[PDB]
Amino acid sequence: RLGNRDMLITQGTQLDCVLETRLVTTQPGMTTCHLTRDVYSTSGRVVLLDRGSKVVGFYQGGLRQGQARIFVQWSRIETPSGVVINLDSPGTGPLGEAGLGGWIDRHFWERFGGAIMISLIGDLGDWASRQGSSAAAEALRNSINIPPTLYKNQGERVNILVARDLDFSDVYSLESIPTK
Amino acid sequence: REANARAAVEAAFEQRVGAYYNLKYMMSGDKDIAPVNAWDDGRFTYFKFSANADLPSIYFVDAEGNESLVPRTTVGSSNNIIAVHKVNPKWMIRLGNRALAIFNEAYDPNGVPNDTGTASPAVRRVNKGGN
């Protein structure tokens, strides 16, 4: 049984935040988002994370061929009143699909232009030589394996799916308001 | 004595006297993510949002139209005010795939100088470290 459900956020809670930084997966880096809504307790009676709270995360490793989503780990959230909790949770899309996804640059030209250009110049030279009366494989072998790059615009909506139980017993307490 | 100094500092921060307010703000775009109020005090710009509204992301727009990040703090009794740490002629508000432009129609290039090192003209920031 859970201890205090008024000072608790359990696993599988969805935190809806808006992406601040523009995300480009060329280099490893850090992301940042702000909560758009208040997050209540599991009992649904106490606001544990206020809206406008700042979440800091990071990504690394880049993408592989055929992948269109990057894994983002959100590391820490700071409440506007100064509460800090280390949630190390996976970042998702607006509907909870794993990883952040945007527009993918597959670098078609950087991967095939050398081979195409080599082949076309070879054929043009052969045509000119005939009109008097493999390098392409080497080029392709070296540049075929270029991982794709993901671009995600700023201001996009994302979710943080809480991977562990968050306990707020040490930083908040409740008191009744004197009536009238 | 230090409690007395801290109380004096908090009182000076709260008193907030001699402040001029600019309310000449226009908006165009997606009005569903719009604030209910926007103003600035000459140092910070404040956007107030309703209780049922999601808090959006706010961006700094330069003369050429490029957007850039600006630091923000969330203030207000119910965290309904976003305070950005700059005064600028144009602002961009984005939430998801909706955008709204905010225009400061009384932009003062001069502003008011920050001679004290704090957000208030009643508190100095003083160099403790010496060295």
Binding site: - | M27, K31, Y46, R94, N97, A99
Partner: peptide, 28 residues
Amino acid sequence: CASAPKPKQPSDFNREPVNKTVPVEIQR
């Protein structure tokens, strides 16, 4: 031949005042 799409640019037609009423934080 393909570039990253830009975020939506807001339309500059329906330009209206933000402040319909004076905020109460201004104490007015």
